[PDB]
Ligand binder design. Structure first.
Ligand SMILES: *[C@](*)(C=O)CC[C@H](N)C(=O)O
Ligand SMILES: *[C@](*)(C=O)CC[C@H](N)C(=O)O
Ligand SMILES: *[C@](*)(C=O)CC[C@H](N)C(=O)O
Ligand SMILES: *[C@](*)(C=O)CC[C@H](N)C(=O)O
Lengths: 330, 330, 330, 330
């Protein structure tokens, strides 16, 4: 029969509202509740038996680590339930990529977990939210969606929660991945073209049930004439690990290297990422002697993704060699 | 009757060196001299009369504001000479997009200024440097190249120095612009398909000859659970303007808003940019009341690009409304 | 005051209708008339004084050369009128790129000509048509839109009618150009980032007023084991010129070259294009001796674009050297 | 204990030759031998024990169905030998995507089969061939490469032979897949990010050892004002199946429909593909009643790719429903 799908609403633009129908970029996020959001798509009933639950009502750029745990643990409870077949989470696009990757690492279930949002508020003309939610439920109730990890369904695509990222502003095609979408969803039907190769959900060594609180991890941006100011201030404020958002291949300025070395000697993990996020990856020992300095490379993960993985990995290990191995498998 | 082109060497991967021919990503930059580079491309003579000049031998990620002024002034001197028709600058790829944009804003000349680099060291197999240098001189010696602002010539393309960006790591197609290439360079021939719409070089209200010092501008990255720590730290250490690299449409977490407001009252310019750099732009008054807070929006410019424009702009005005106009015109 | 905008409706998906709101890819095109299409966007009134006119009601893949002339001449009449400031044409996406390029070459006016369509029918949920039409009128009533040539406004972008093409199926971001969009349209405001470099509208040597009928031009596809069968059959059926949709750089199979040579000797113009349409261009004399055989290269234009330019150019010249010059300027 | 890799040379640009070092696009293909190619990359020895074999010396645009069978059978023989671990095939870029897909369908083996080419002749500056060949052997000698189907290694990427396509002319980044790269190859090391979802090699129901002849399949291009001329001509000359390269979602002009129906009754398979090859796919029963007319839809495969699948499929069945299943699984 129909699959049982639960919709966990967290707010965002999909639940936002603007001044008029012409307002597709200027609006107030997290204004509409889950039940009114479900009622806007009557054709949802033909896809599955759907239930709405309001986990929170926020603008995603203002999300906290405790908001993540709250959502993560609620997902884990729903997943354990026999009466729940799939899970759809409505999330603001700003940090959707962070939450999607977090869930991918800590939810040890093969049940479909789909995160969805929209680039235009439901009050705008040609609002992308209705179809995105339809596609979300369509994918969550599909048996073929199992064992694929966390999924993001926007712009008629099925993107991997791991490496999808908000790469384009304003437009509905906002979410892209350097390794392409896994498939597409058209008229309730899912079409797969690729499979993930990185560890996730059921085969992850991490488990949200064991996590009580996440370690503080912060990101410093690198550019011309950059100093160590931001790096030291974040570390002094409690950061257990710093994500270096370097130029090119995770490059570090000669006048910032000393700060990073002493920060490492003082127990802070130094993870090299970059602001070159359309493609490619940061190679270990290429731009900097990571072995010599005992640093970690973030591979292909962008700064915000790298932070998420760092937080999670550190609840299990403070070993840099193991942290490096984790950045190469997840 | 061959044009006179001067090559201004600054280091980078083009003048880099790896341990073997199989080393295309692991190597040491700034190892080769200017006339050694010129000697490797004998065919350069066919295109024009080339003169080499070593301005500096550095890795671009370690560039400083003074290095920018030195290069900017050396370029201005060459531009005023009648014995110079076009100017080529070999520069490390890491911060090439920053320098190229700086020159696009402060060089009051219609003579071609082409910045070029390479993703592979000249010691590697299939090194991309030689052809890149050849195309650079080909474009600099071409009369059709005048009046189009600063250009970057890599991957057989003619990119605008304004918005071209290092978006992909490792690959030779590293540089991309959200608005596309202006043209292409094939077998010494230039092909134009697009023209710049933004103010540059000749019609720029800025001039390197009147610029003696650049104000300190820093960048703070925004993400999930971000605090005002780095923002305040950077401001306390001399930052006259802070480039906010926000999530989505330059969004600011509710927790960082009051700090940004206080730093604004204290005279630090708040420029909202984003880490969504593949397309679109940050819209004024959308995600935040820029009018109420007297903040500036970076339009389509990424963080590092917005930093350069801010620096240059602030040498002429500290009026936020004038600053916004400038970000909308350059 | 408000600009006078005329909407010329030709049918297509924007005027289509599906079985239910879930039907975004399966529908019946050309079902809704222009007046009902205008009435679906009440906010259109705030943008300009709009008038609707039904030129035809067809599915664009079934468009004829006489349908093009009909539309082309009707545009020319509206453009000559002082009571018309801008023109918007609703057209099916399938051959939108053909019509947009045709108008770009034959309408000698600086008035804004905007072609628009949608990827989903107005009956679907999250239909992209309403906003596309709004953006179309917004752009057509903008004084800054003048002298830019023919424009296509879809997916919040402003694309050039010359090289925009339907490159992706199903998705709203269907239209792409190898040289990028000219700008974007967000909330009725137009933002420009690039300018066209190719000849168009007011500076075109072609004029629809002089054209009574277009020459027959056809396209043959090239692949592995291709024979001359299609090339000879099309020519024998009246084709004055054949567009060779070759592999790679307009390459021609060794067993197809003879047919092309004799076809040329018999008065048929041979234009080399390719099915490598994401980027780059076909170089003259590279893959085949175009000078020796007196062939023409289509530069960067795809097969269907190349056909449009061929048809138009031939109403003025049957000279191959001049045809080549035209393919290098338009 | 170095793996044994055989390089099967077939010609192309890698073995091409230009007049000078400045000639990167104008040159003559198939000029260099297999052991001359191997001698140019001495470092190849570090990776594995390599044996060279010249199967043919042709320009890929002039490839025939028999050339495919010859290569396909020579590959099968090498695959069954225990003295062969991986197979590298140097092939002209023009029809590389066709051959690579053919081999992906008919080679019943999990041993690595890597097809490689280059955009610049080895005589040119910054020729891309040497590194491309190095990566090819690096990937073929890697145990991780087994069971992933045919791979193409250019531009530092690991592309799937199924959907990789020559999408950009001139540039080294010529090959692109709508579903993204599977991984990357850097400094002799392979990095995987995605796995194939479609049937290939080992789990393919096809086998080159049981294939003696390939049925003739041709392609007709669709556009504005298209007639049934080429469709009928191709069918009258032996075409057992016609690949319709339609506009949009494989749409067919109302004028060409009756002819396609008559050719179907006569036994010619009608496969609807499109010239919208950057993304998306052709949907069954959307633009045309495929069920009523007993036609087949090519899914996401471009024209030349659909031709190869049709050829191979038709050696096993002429049942249209079975043919549709095959297009949905491979
Ligand atoms: C509109 C786009 O989704 C609202 C975005 C907002 N910053 C959010 O909640 O992420
Ligand atoms: C090679 C990439 O171009 C070396 C880059 C280096 N970090 C630089 O000088 O920017
Ligand atoms: C829907 C997409 O626009 C209908 C497309 C149809 N083939 C047309 O009229 O172009
Ligand atoms: C260079 C591009 O690879 C030569 C291509 C030639 N037409 C071929 O052999 O395919």
């Amino acid at each position: 029969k129909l699959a049982n799908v639960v919709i966990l609403a967290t707010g965002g633009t999909i639940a936002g509202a603007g001044a008029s129908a012409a307002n597709s970029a200027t609006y107030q996020a997290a204004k509409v509740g889950v039940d009114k959001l479900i009622a806007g798509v009557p054709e949802l009933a033909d896809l599955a038996n759907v239930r709405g639950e309001q986990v929170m009502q926020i603008a995603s750029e203002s999300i906290t680590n405790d908001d993540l745990l709250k959502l993560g643990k609620r997902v884990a409870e729903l997943a354990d339930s026999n009466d729940v077949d799939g899970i759809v989470i409505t999330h603001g696009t700003d940090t959707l990529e962070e939450t999607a990757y977090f869930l991918n690492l800590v939810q040890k279930t093969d049940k479909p977990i789909v995160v969805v949002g929209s680039m235009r508020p439901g009050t705008a003309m040609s609002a992308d939210g209705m179809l995105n939610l339809y596609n979300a439920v369509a994918v969550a109730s599909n048996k073929d969606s199992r064992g694929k990890g966390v999924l993001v369904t926007m712009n008629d695509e099925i993107q991997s929660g791991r490496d999808v990222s908000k790469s384009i502003n304003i437009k509905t095609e906002a979410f892209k991945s350097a390794w392409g979408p896994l498939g597409m969803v058209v008229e309730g039907k899912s079409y797969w073209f690729r499979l993930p190769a990185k560890r996730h959900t059921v085969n992850s060594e991490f488990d949200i049930k064991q996590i009580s609180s996440l370690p503080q991890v912060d990101i410093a941006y690198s550019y011309g004439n950059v100093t160590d100011t931001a790096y030291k201030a974040l570390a002094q404020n409690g950061a257990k690990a710093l994500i270096h958002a370097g130029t090119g291949n995770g490059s570090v300025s000669s006048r910032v290297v000393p700060a990073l070395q002493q920060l490492r000697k003082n127990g802070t993990q130094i993870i090299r990422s970059s602001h070159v996020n359309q493609g490619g990856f940061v190679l270990r020992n290429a731009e900097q002697p990571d072995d010599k300095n005992d640093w970690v490379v973030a591979h292909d993960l962008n700064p915000e993704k790298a932070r998420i993985l760092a937080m999670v990995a550190m609840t299990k290990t403070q070993d840099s060699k193991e942290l490096q191995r984790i950045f190469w498998e997840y």
